[PDB]
Design a protein around this ligand. Sequence first.
Ligand SMILES: CCN1CCN(CC(=O)[C@@H]2Cc3ccccc3CN2)C(=O)c2ccc(C(=O)N3CCC4(CC3)CC(OC)C4)cc21
Ligand SMILES: CCN1CCN(CC(=O)[C@@H]2Cc3ccccc3CN2)C(=O)c2ccc(C(=O)N3CCC4(CC3)CC(OC)C4)cc21
Ligand SMILES: C[S@@+](CC[C@H](N)C(=O)[O-])C[C@H]1O[C@@H](n2cnc3c(N)ncnc32)[C@H](O)[C@@H]1O
Ligand SMILES: C[S@@+](CC[C@H](N)C(=O)[O-])C[C@H]1O[C@@H](n2cnc3c(N)ncnc32)[C@H](O)[C@@H]1O
Lengths: 302, 625, 625
Amino acid sequence: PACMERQLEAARYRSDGALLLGASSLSGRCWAGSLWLFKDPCAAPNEGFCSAGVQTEAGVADLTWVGERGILVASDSGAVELWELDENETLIVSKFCKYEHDDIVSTVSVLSSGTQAVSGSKDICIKVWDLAQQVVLSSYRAHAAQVTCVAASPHKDSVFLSCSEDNRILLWDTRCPKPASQIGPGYLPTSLAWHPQQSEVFVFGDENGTVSLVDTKSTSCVLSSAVHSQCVTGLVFSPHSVPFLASLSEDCSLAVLDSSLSELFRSQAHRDFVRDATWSPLNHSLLTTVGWDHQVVHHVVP
Amino acid sequence: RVSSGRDLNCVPEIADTLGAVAKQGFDFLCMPVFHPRFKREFIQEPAKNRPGPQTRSDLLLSGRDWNTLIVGKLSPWIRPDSKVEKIRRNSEAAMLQELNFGAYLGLPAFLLPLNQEDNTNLARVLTNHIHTGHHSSMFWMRVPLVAPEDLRDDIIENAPTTHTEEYSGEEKTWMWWHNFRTLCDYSKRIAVALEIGADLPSNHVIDRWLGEPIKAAILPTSIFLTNKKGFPVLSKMHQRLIFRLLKLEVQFIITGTNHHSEKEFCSYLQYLEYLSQNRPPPNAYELFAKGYEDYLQSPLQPLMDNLESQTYEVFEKDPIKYSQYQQAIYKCLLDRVPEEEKDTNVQVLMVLGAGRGPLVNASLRAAKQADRRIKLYAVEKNPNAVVTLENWQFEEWGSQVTVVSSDMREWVAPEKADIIVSELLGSFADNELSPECLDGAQHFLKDDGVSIPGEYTSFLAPISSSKLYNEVRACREKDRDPEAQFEMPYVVRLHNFHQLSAPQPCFTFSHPNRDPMIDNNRYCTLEFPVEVNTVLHGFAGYFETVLYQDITLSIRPETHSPGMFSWFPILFPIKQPITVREGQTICVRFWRCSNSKKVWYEWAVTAPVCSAIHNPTGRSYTIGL
Amino acid sequence: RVSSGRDLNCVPEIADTLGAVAKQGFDFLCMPVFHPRFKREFIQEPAKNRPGPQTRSDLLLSGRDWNTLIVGKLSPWIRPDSKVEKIRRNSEAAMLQELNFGAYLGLPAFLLPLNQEDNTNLARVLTNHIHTGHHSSMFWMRVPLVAPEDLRDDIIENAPTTHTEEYSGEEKTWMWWHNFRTLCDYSKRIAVALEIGADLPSNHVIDRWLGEPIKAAILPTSIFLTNKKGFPVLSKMHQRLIFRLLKLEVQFIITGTNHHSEKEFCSYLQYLEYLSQNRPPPNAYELFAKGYEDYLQSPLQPLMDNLESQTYEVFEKDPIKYSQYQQAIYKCLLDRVPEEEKDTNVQVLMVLGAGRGPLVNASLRAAKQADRRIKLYAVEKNPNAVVTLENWQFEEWGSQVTVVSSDMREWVAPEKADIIVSELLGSFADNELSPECLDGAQHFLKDDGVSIPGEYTSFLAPISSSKLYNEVRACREKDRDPEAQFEMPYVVRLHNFHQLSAPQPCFTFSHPNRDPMIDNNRYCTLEFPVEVNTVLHGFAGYFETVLYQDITLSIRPETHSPGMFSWFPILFPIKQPITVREGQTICVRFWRCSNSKKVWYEWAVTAPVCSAIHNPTGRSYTIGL
Ligand SMILES: CCN1CCN(CC(=O)[C@@H]2Cc3ccccc3CN2)C(=O)c2ccc(C(=O)N3CCC4(CC3)CC(OC)C4)cc21
Ligand SMILES: CCN1CCN(CC(=O)[C@@H]2Cc3ccccc3CN2)C(=O)c2ccc(C(=O)N3CCC4(CC3)CC(OC)C4)cc21
Ligand SMILES: C[S@@+](CC[C@H](N)C(=O)[O-])C[C@H]1O[C@@H](n2cnc3c(N)ncnc32)[C@H](O)[C@@H]1O
Ligand SMILES: C[S@@+](CC[C@H](N)C(=O)[O-])C[C@H]1O[C@@H](n2cnc3c(N)ncnc32)[C@H](O)[C@@H]1O
C-alpha cells in the first residue's frame, strides 16, 4: 500500500457508493499491480485516503465486482484471481489465483446471476469460471486472434458477448451444443456493452471511433457515429431509465451518447489514454473517469 | 544439450524472473522490452507526450546478461499492416522504436509474428531497420504451422469452417513466411521460429519447413500429454518432429502456462532433455561430417594444383574406399589369373595417381590376399608426393614397386599394363578429369585390360534451400562477375534443405572407352516430378561407382556407402529462385563442355520457367586440364 | 612466455633432433627441408636425373608436427640472383621446388636470406610463388642489421675497410629489405627476421626496423657475454633492444653453436625467459589496449548513429576522464560562486550529450564537493539513453535533475545556462562535430557562461608503418571506390610503427566562439623535419584538451593522460608510400571542409613529393551532421 501505481486501468463504483481503482505500473523497473477501494472516491487517487488496497504479482487489465465484497482481477500474467474484500473494508485478501490462460488476460466479466465468470486472453481461448468451486467449466477456443473484449448479459445468465481482432462478434450461450453465434468486413471491433433495459441491444465500438448499435437477431447496423477519432476503449451505459452511453477512446476524449448517438458531453479532462469510466451509483449526474494520466476526473454530465 | 528458453509475457521483476528461469534450467528468456499493454502514441497530443520513462532501465542487467540471455519480443499491439491509416503510422513508429531499443540493449535475437497474409508494410519496416546502423540482433519471425483460423474449435453455430480438402489451404502459413522472406530479400538476418501446434500437417509440409532457416521451434505447454505417472510426454509423431528439429540444432522454447499443476514447471525441459538424450545416434558419416553442415567449399583444381599433405592425410582415414579398392583388386587378380598359373603369370598393375601410397599398399595387400604375383608402377603427378613414394619405395616396397614421376597422359610406359587401379573420382564423379586422364592413359592398357573403376555415374536431385541459397549469395568476391558466385559448383555437406525429388542419372562414364571416336561431351535432359509448392534453389549432385563386377562406392544418400567421408555432395546453384507449383515437372539440362584446354558444366532450367544458361563457355568455373 | 626456436643446419634424425630441442624448452625449429649441400641440377644430364628420393619423407612427422613446430629454410646454394645464367636458371628452379615442398608440408613460415643488394630475381620468384595455388606459409626474409662486409675483422692487409663516416653505408641493409619488399609489393606474407649482430647501429636505425613487420629476431650464440658465475648475459644496450622486440611480440631464435661448453645449451633460452620476466611492466593504458594493436577501426558517426549500450558501458570504466570532469566542474563552480553566496546563488548546468548518466553523476558529485546548489539538465539525443536517464531521474536524482530528449542544436531551453559540461570530443578532438554542436548550443549560454571543455586541440605526427599501410590496403570492400580505403581516418591503437617526427598543433578549437563570424573551416600547413631515410605511410592524429583553467585531458603520447582508454589515436593514410630522404622536411596540409549538411577532412603532402588531394569533397569519408 505504499503508493498507487502510475497507470490506472479500471474503476468500478460499488453499489453502496464506493470506488474500486485498478492500477498497474506499465513503466519503470517493476511492472506490478494494485487494487484500490475508496469510500470517498473524490479523495482518490491520493493513497493516503484509501480505505483499502493491496498488491498483486503483476498488472491489472480489468476488474469487476462480484457481489459486494468480491473482486475479479485479470493479471498481465494470465491468471484470474479473486480478492474477497475483508469484512472491515480495511484489508484485501486473495482467495485463489488460478494460472489458467497462456498469455495476457485482457478482459473479465461476471455472468448475470453473479456465480460464474468469463475471461479472454491473447491466447485466443475464452474461458468460463465457477467462482464458488474455483475451476474452469468451459474453455472454448472460438476466435482466431486475441479476444478484445467481453460483456456478460445483464439479464440472461447464459449470454455474453465477445469481440475479437479477427472481426468476429460472437453472442454466446452456455446451453447450446454449439455456443457461438456470429452476429455482425468493417472496422475491427474493440468494445462491447449490453443495453441495460432493452436486453437484446448491444453496442460494439470499433477501431476507428464509430460506436455502433446492432440488434442480435436483426444484424442491420442500426445507428453508428464516428464520435472518436481513435479506438473506442470502452462503453458503459448510464443508470437512468433511458440511459446514456459513455464513450472513451485512445484520443484522450470522453463523450456521452444517446439512443440517436447524439453527442451530449465531451471532456478533454484527461491528458492521456482514458482507460475506463463509471457512473455514480448515488448521483446519476456524476461520472468518474480514470486514465493513464493518473487523474481521476469527476464529470457532471447534463 | 539443446538450448531452450522460456517465453514470457509477465515479468514484473526482470532480475527475479530471470533468476527463476535459470534455476528451472532454461538457458535464455524471451521477454517483452516495452510493456505489452503500454500503447504509446507518436502522432497527436496530448497522448504524444506521456512523460517518461518508456520502459525498464537499460541497467537492470549487465551488457552480458542482456546480450547472452534475453530475446526481445515485438509488442502485441503493434500492427504495422492494419488498415486504419492512423494505426499503420503508429505501428510503423512503435516497431521502429522497439527494434532500435532491442539493438541498443544488444539482444541476440528478436521475435516477430506472422499472423496474417498482408505483411508487406512489416517487411518494409523491418528491412529499413536492417539497413540502418551497425547492429547484430537476429530476427526470429514466429509463424505457426497451422493458422489460428484453422486451429479453432468448431463452436460457431453460424459460420462453420470448410472442412473439405483444402490442400494449400493447409499450406497458407508457409506461403505467409515465403512472401515475408522474399520481400525482405532473403536477408540472412531473418529466420523462422516454427510454432508447433497440437496437430501436425502432412509429411510433405514438415519436409517443407526444413530447408527453411528454422532457428527455434516453439512448443506450447498445451501440447504435452500426461503420462500415468503424472508427467508430460509427447506422442510418437510429435517426437518424430522434435527429433528432426533436434538434428537441425534449433533452440526450443516453452511458451504458455504450466498445465501440470501437480508437478513444478521444469518437467517440460526435463522431457526435452530426455528426448535429446534418447534420439537415434548419429551414424559414422554424420560423426565425421559434423562441423561442416551447409558450409560451401570451392572444389579442387585436379591438374593445376598440388594436393597438400594435410589433405592426403585426412582422406587416408576413410574406412571404406580403401577396403573396396583392395577387394576389387583381389577379385580382378583372381579373375585374370587362375589357380594353376598363380606362379607363372605375373600381373602388372599401374596405379594412376598414387598419392602418398595408400592405393599401392592396398594393391600389395590384395596381391597377397589373392596369391598372385604383381609388378606395380605408381604414376604420381605431384612431385612432392613423388618424394613420399620414393621414400616408401626405398624403405619398404623394394624393387617390387616402380615409381614414375609424370602425368599419366604424358608418361611413356616401359611395358603395357593389365590392371590399372586409378582413383580420380570427384565429388560429382566426372568433374575432376577422370575421363580425360584415363582416356589419355588407355593407350598403354592391353587389349583386355581392366580399369578400376570400370564405370562411374553422376546423379542430380533438385534441392530447395534458403540457407544454402543465401550461402551462395554471400559467396561474392571483389574483382569478378557480380553474378558468378551462382555459376560454379560448391562442394558441401548439404544439411539444411529439402530434396524435391529423386536423383536421376546425369552422366554415365565407363572405362576403357574403346569406342572408335572418343568424345567426353555430354548432354542430358531430366524431369523431376515436384509434388509440393516450394522454391528451387539448385541441383545437388552425387555419384555411384562400380570398381569391379559388384564392389561399389557411392555417396548418393539412398545407397550411400557406409561411413565414406572421402566425398561430399556438390551444389550447382541457379541464378534465381524458381517458384514451383506442386504437380509440375522441373526440367533441367546439362552439357558437359570441354575443349582442348579446359572443361566445364553448363546448366539451365527449361521448365516450369526458363533460367539463363548458367556458366556459358565456362566463364565462371572451368576445370583446368 | 615468448616463443623461441633453435635454428639448425645439422638434423641427421628429424625426430631425435626435434625431441632434443623440445626438451631444451624451445617451441619450434628452423630446419632445412632439402639437404644443404645437396646441389640438384634441373637443366642438363646426366646430373638432371639423380634417382630419388629428393629429401626426407613427408611422413617422418605428423601433419601437426610439420605445421606447428617446424620452419623451413631455403638452401644456402640457391642463389637466384647470381650472374651466371646457368646458376640463375638452376636457382630459379630449386627455389620454386623448395618453396612448393614447404607449402605442401604445411610449414608455418619459411626463412629466406637477403645477403646482397641485387635481390630482384629473388623477389620475382617469390611473388610468383605467392600467386600460385592456395597455401598459407609465411615467409621470414632473414636480413642482418649490419652487413657481413661490415662485420668483418680488419685483417686484410691490402684492402682495409672504409672506417670513415658512412651514414647510409650503415643503413644499406634496411634499403636491401626495402627494395625487396617493394618489389614483392608489400605482400602481407613477407615479414622480416631481424638478425642481431654483436654491435648495434645507432638509435635512429633501430627505430627504423620497428614499424617493419619484424616477425622474429635471430640472436646468435656469439653475442652472449659470460658472467662471473659462468652463464650468458647480454649487455645493457642489447637488453634494451631485446625489450623493444619483446614488446613487439617477436619469436626469438637461437642460431649458432653452443659457446658455453661448461653449461648445457638451454641456458640461453633460460636467459631470454629471465629477461622477458624482468621487462618493465606494461602500464595501465597498455593493459587495456592489449588485444587492439594495429587493428584499424572505422570511426563513429556521431549524429547519424545511436551508441549501443555496450559502448557506453565499456567507456564508463575510464579512470581519468570522469575524475577530470568532476574536478573541472568543482573548480568552475567555486570560481563562479564565492563562499558567501553558497546558499543564495543557484547555478544551472546543462550537460550536453548526457549518455547513460556519468557526466551528470559527476556533476552532482562536484556540486556537493564545492558546496554549491545546482540545477542540472541533460540533453541526450539518443532516445534509448533518454530511457536510462529517465530511469535515473525518477529513481535517484529526483527533481534536482531535468532530462531533455532532443538535439542540443534544436532544443529550446527554458532558462539560460551558466556552465555546460559537454563531452563530444573525438579521437582527433574535432572530427566528431563538437564544434558544430556546441556552436549551435551557445545561443542559450549566458554572456559569461563557461563551456567545458573550453578548448581542445588536435595533433599530427607523420608515421611510417608497413603493418598499418598494408592494413589499410587490406581494408578494401566490394561496391565502392577501389582507392577509398586510403581516404578515411581509422581509429587505431598505433603500435607497430615509427613516428618520424614530433606532433604539431593542427586545429585549435575554443568555446564559446563569441567571434562575430562563426567559421569552423580550417587550413593548416605543417613541416615535420625528417632525419632518417624511411617511408611515410600516413599522418597520425592525437589531441590535448583544456577542461578548466588547468585540468586537462590528452592522448598525445608525450603528455598522455594516465590510463585514459576513452580515446585511441587516429590514422590518416595517404594513397602511396612517399620515399623520404633524411634531412628533408615532410610538408602536409589539412583543410577541414564542412558544408550545410556534412563535414570532412582533406589531406595532401606537398613536399618532398606531391600526393593527390585525398578525400576531395568528402567522397570517401564525411561525418554526417
Ligand atoms: C574442399 C572441400 N573438400 C575437397 C575434397 N573433397 C573433394 C574430393 O573430391 C576428394 C579429393 C581427394 C584428394 C585426395 C585424396 C582423396 C580425395 C577424394 N575426393 C571433399 O569432398 C571433401 C570431403 C570431405 C571434407 C571434410 O570436410 N573433411 C574430411 C573428412 C572428415 C571431415 C572433414 C572426417 C575426417 O576427420 C578425421 C576429416 C572436405 C572435402
Ligand atoms: C570504434 C573504435 N573505437 C570508437 C571509440 N572510440 C572513439 C571515441 O571517440 C570515443 C567515443 C565515445 C562514446 C561513448 C562514450 C565515450 C566515447 C569516447 N570517445 C575509441 O577511441 C575507441 C577507444 C577504445 C576502444 C577499445 O578497443 N576498447 C575500449 C577500452 C578498453 C579496450 C577496448 C579497456 C576496456 O576494457 C575494460 C575496454 C575502441 C574505440
Ligand atoms: C584425387 S587424388 C587421390 C589419389 C590417391 N589414390 C588417393 O587415394 O588419395 C588423385 C591423385 O592423383 C594424382 N594425379 C592427378 N591427376 C593426375 C594425372 N593426370 N596424371 C597422373 N597423376 C595424377 C594427384 O597427385 C592426386 O594426388
Ligand atoms: C561521445 S558520447 C559521450 C557522452 C557522455 N558524456 C559520455 O561520457 O559517454 C556523446 C553523447 O552525446 C549525445 N549527443 C551526440 N550528439 C548530440 C547532439 N548533437 N545533441 C545532443 N546530444 C548529442 C549522444 O547520445 C552521445 O551518446
